[PDB]
Write a protein that binds this DNA or RNA. Sequence first.
DNA 1: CACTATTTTAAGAAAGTGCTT
DNA 2: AAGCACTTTCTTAAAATAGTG
Lengths: 90, 89, 55
Amino acid sequence: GRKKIQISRILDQRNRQVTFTKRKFGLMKKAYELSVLCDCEIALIIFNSANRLFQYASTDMDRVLLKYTEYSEPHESRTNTDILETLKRR
Amino acid sequence: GRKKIQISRILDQRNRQVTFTKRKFGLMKKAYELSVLCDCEIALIIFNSANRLFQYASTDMDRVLLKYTEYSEPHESRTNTDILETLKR
Amino acid sequence: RVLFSQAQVYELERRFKQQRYLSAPERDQLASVLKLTSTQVKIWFQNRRYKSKRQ
DNA sequence: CACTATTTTAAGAAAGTGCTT
DNA sequence: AAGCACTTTCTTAAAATAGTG
């Protein structure tokens, strides 16, 4: 808040690290809210610029990943590229 | 929202489904923003009430899961239980 | 814990565009006009200088 | 989907801390 | 004393969203 920021790589390492920790909490909080509100199983895996791991799971990471491996059907499967296109068209 | 909602299972099937699709887009949007802003590799796997799968990955799901497979180092690992405690400020 | 007025900040910023650093007397003179303390102008300029490099 | 009142998120501002000259 | 490098606490504008046809 206070000024609109463009969605592009933050140039300044320290700014990048503060923004990262803020938005990581925000993302895990929203994941938690969704899981509880809509009774869903969510897994979130984050690797930062320094390749350090941070993970959230609603119930248990292993259970969700097992259910994922043995889904055996087409599903909504999005990348940064596909997302960029979906946002530009609105 | 027009009303503040408490964080509990929505007990109205149709409301649950509309809230789900809204907040799933919002979550994937924030995941995308984080990935681009902070140069991060993110994987997001969501199973709804009906056990239907929805997934986002910054670049490629398999690459992130591989990197996650071989990684035995003390890292932040959060569940709904741990989150509940952390939210009491 | 209170933020400065947009008139205070307008003059602080206008002055910062001319000079990144103030002398103690210069600082006191400005503080008087803006209705701030010497400490407040000092630390404002310190913070603004830091943020300028974090662009 | 659109609308929009209202809530929630996170960027940025002042002050705190700690070290150097 | 004042500079700089963070860090911390809080405010507030931007973004998300609940309730609704």
